[PDB]
């Protein structure tokens, strides 16, 4: 019983039209859109009920639009993106037409609005094998994954052991760091660690993989540079078990 | 029109209690909502408060409502690591739109047992590209200060839990693309305890 | 005019106040084409179908605990709240009645005529109008139109008296109203 | 003893809706469905109190949805027209030359749709003209008031022409000086 939002993240050029799609809870009566600019408060945009706009933000209408095409989907359309449209877009729904209940929020779409797509770069992903010293001292093995040089911010790092995603023994930086912190178009770096028992790491029939999902250029975006189009992609690095 | 939350950020040691406040208009009141917002998750409702003087409990989380004064208090008793989230309060007037506060970002500092602080050097990815230093197994009191040097990169502390093992640990990572960079000098700006193990 | 069928959805949310706000009875009523089908009475505490038309709503609305709770709290959050919001210009609204005394027709002495007492532009509705022949109250021959609502927070009344007047006669009209400390008296003589 | 009523309706196919607050048979305010603003009965009430028009607009939206559901539920049973009673009266006792107001009170009718025009010597008047919205009643029928400020004269006759679907032809209520 949840609200779903696609895509997770989106990169768009300034001035272009964007469509944030959403799937409210099936039997819900009221549908909403909220947005949050980084470091700012979650702000209301629009509410919708029985095929009509109920309340709208003082900004909305002059810029945005909503549509309810079928009894399953709800969408938000930004006519012409601006640098100030860079926010996390939340979709919500509530069951009662009276409003005396909670609003269920979607996971949100991270929209990044850029002046130019030229500075978009996918990450480089590398895995650093555990220190033999660490093994000899703690009988534990820490693998380190680094995702570097990506632009813009927000990638999803995951660890896979023998084809299965692992969450135990894992920790990833909640926020990435800037490579050239002076620059405003500065690329990012993100790290993560996976810790296992020395026995587990020493078994050579154990495969370790680090995956980074990057959200970049779209199917219909323009690309004129010599380097590979920085499209949405999964970049990965791997490590095998060493008996040592 | 306006909702304010205090404090903006908050640190609490595992097991300890904390609380934070929400201020909303004292006019045209219909409801006050509290939402829990974890990092990559969606904001999930904790409470919908409508009656003045009511106290609601959802396990270790309590909420109070005072409509006349225009305030709400959220209480977290025996704080657990899973309680780390941004707590947002929203005010509802006659319509359905919610007016949100700035939130209270809660960081529950975990209890670290068996602290063996150490700085290791992992074997570089084929080969070499960069050198990686790992500061692991330190106590929650040890603060990881920034790089200081522009050529070196240092990430803030991070807690990993081996659920099966019931073991929790801190870690920070240091890296640099050549040449003088090494383990001993890696975490200079940070307060490294004298007990910190260095393998030679 | 237009002969197309009409469909009307009407709803009332009633707040009945007894002894100030000491006792409050609340009612949320739903009508379809003049027919009340479902209601919530604070004295019942839940939604009850009035007709067969209300049946689905009765079971559906009582199954919605957030909505049902809004109704159980209405006596305070809604009724008493709203009572206090307007109390000073509503329960406390006091408008002075303007009093005029005149004969209806230009009929000569010793013959019948109707003595009109016009009480106008007053608030609230409660008013006592009394006719006096020669200091003594006349209970008979008093024709009232009753209380007339002007639909603008003012009332009016025409209290007429059947009169066969004499040369010495002194007719006096008394107006007792909440907005007046000293009762108003207007006199007419032949 | 006091009664506070929140009266709301929605009518099809007219697509006409109404939201009002009533205190002891008098209107406090209503929400204008065109302007989407609160219209206070006496200007002073807007100085002593507030209202968020949105609460009323949200309720009208629901009444509109509920009308669609109740129509289907009743097997499309239409409303029976109840024609109105019309009374013409004055604000205060009439006196030649001193300004007065003609009150046209339309009562005990349903649906709440009425075409009301003021006639002076058979011709229509709109000068200084005001009206109320549809007011509630204990019997669930409606009330309406129309106002005409006028200068009493012996040379003038007035009429209030009322049109309701429950009336065979338009009802006229006469007034003249006497």
């Amino acid at each position: 019983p949840e609200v779903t939002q696609t895509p997770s993240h989106q990169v768009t050029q300034m001035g272009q039209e964007v469509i944030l799609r959403c799937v409210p809870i099936s039997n819900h009566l009221y549908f909403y859109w909220y947005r949050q600019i980084l470091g700012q408060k979650v702000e209301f945009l629009v509410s919708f009920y029985n095929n009509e706009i109920s309340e709208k933000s003082e900004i909305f209408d002059d810029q945005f639009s909503v549509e309810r095409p079928d009894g399953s989907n709800f969408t938000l359309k930004i006519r012409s993106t601006k640098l100030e449209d860079s926010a996390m877009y939340f979709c919500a729904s509530s069951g009662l037409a009276g409003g005396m209940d909670e609003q269920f929020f979607g996971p949100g779409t991270r929209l990044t609005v850029l002046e130019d797509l030229k500075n978009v770069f996918p990450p480089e992903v590398a895995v650093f094998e555990p220190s033999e010293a660490e093994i000899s001292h703690t009988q534990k093995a820490t693998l380190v994954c680094l995702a570097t040089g990506f632009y813009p911010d927000h990638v999803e790092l995951s660890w896979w052991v023998n084809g299965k995603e692992v969450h135990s023994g894992v920790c990833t930086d909640p926020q990435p760091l800037k490579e050239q912190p002076a620059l405003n178009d500065s690329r990012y770096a993100l790290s993560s660690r996976l810790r296992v028992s020395a026995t587990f790491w020493q078994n050579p029939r154990n495969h370790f993989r680090c995956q980074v999902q990057f959200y970049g250029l779209s199917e219909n975006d323009e690309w004129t540079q010599d380097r590979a189009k920085p499209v949405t992609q999964i970049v990965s690095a791997e490590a095998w078990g060493r008996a040592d | 029109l306006n909702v304010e939350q205090s404090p903006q950020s908050l640190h609490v040691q595992e097991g300890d209690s904390t609380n934070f406040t929400c201020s909303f208009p004292s006019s045209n009141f219909y409801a006050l909502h509290w939402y829990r917002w974890e990092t990559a998750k969606s904001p999930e409702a904790l409470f919908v408060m409508t009656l003045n003087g009511d106290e609601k409990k959802k396990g270790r989380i309590s909420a109070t409502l005072n409509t006349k004064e225009g305030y709400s208090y959220l209480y977290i008793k025996g704080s657990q690591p899973e309680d780390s989230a941004t707590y947002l309060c929203a005010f509802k007037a006659a319509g359905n739109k919610l007016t949100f506060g700035g939130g209270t970002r809660v960081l529950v500092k975990p209890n670290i047992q068996n602290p063996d602080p150490a700085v290791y050097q992992l074997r570089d990815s084929k080969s070499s590209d960069k050198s990686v230093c790992l500061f692991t197994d330190f106590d929650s009191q040890t603060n990881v200060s920034q790089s200081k040097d522009s050529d070196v990169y240092i990430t803030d502390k991070c807690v990993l839990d081996m659920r099966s093992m019931d073991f929790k640990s801190n870690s920070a990572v240091a890296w640099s693309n050549k040449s003088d960079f090494a383990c001993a000098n890696a975490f200079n700006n940070s307060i490294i305890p004298e007990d910190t193990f260095f393998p030679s | 005019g237009d002969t197309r069928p009409r469909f009307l959805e009407y709803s009332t949310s009633e707040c009945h106040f007894f002894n100030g706000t000491e006792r409050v009875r609340f009612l949320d009523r739903y009508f379809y084409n003049q027919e009340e089908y479902v209601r919530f009475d604070s004295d019942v505490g839940e939604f009850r179908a009035v007709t067969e038309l209300g049946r689905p709503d009765e079971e559906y609305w009582n199954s919605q605990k957030d909505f049902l709770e809004d109704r159980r709290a209405a006596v305070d959050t809604y009724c008493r709240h709203n009572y206090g919001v307007g109390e000073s210009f509503t329960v406390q609204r006091r408008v002075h009645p303007k009093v005029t005394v005149y004969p209806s027709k230009t009929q000569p002495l010793q013959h019948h005529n109707l003595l009109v007492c016009s009480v106008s532009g007053f608030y609230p509705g409660s008013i006592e109008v009394r006719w006096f022949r020669n200091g003594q109250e006349e209970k008979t021959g008093v024709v009232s139109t009753g209380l007339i609502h002007n639909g603008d927070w003012t009332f009016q009344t025409l209290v007429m008296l059947e009169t066969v007047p004499r040369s010495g006669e002194v007719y006096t009209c008394q107006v007792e109203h909440p907005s007046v400390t000293s009762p108003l008296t207007v006199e007419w003589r032949a | 003893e006091h009664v506070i009523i929140q009266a709301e309706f929605y009518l099809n196919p007219d697509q006409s809706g109404e939201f009002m607050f009533d205190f002891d048979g008098d209107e406090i305010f209503h929400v204008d469905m065109a302007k989407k603003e609160t219209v206070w009965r006496l200007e002073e009430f807007g100085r002593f109190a507030s209202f968020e028009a949105q609460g009323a607009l949200a309720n009208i939206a629901v009444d509109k949805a509920n009308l669609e559901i109740m129509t289907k539920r009743s097997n499309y049973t239409p409303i029976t027209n109840v024609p109105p009673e019309v009374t013409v009266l004055t604000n205060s006792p009439v006196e030649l030359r001193e300004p007065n107001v003609l009150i046209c009170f339309i009562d005990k009718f349903t649906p709440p749709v009425v075409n009301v025009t003021w006639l002076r010597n058979g011709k229509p008047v709109t000068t200084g003209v005001s009206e109320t919205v549809f007011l509630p009643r204990e019997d669930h029928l409606f009330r309406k008031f129309h106002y005409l400020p006028f200068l009493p004269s012996t040379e003038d006759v007035y009429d209030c022409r009322v049109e309701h679907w429950g009336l065979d032809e338009p009802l006229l209520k006469h007034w003249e000086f006497d």
Binding site: - | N28, Y30 | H81, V85 | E52
Partner: peptide, 13 residues
């Protein structure tokens, strides 16, 4: 102060 609306709910379908 504010006159509060008693909020209406959608009927059963």
């Amino acid at each position: 102060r504010f006159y509060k609306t008693l909020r209406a709910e959608q009927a059963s379908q």
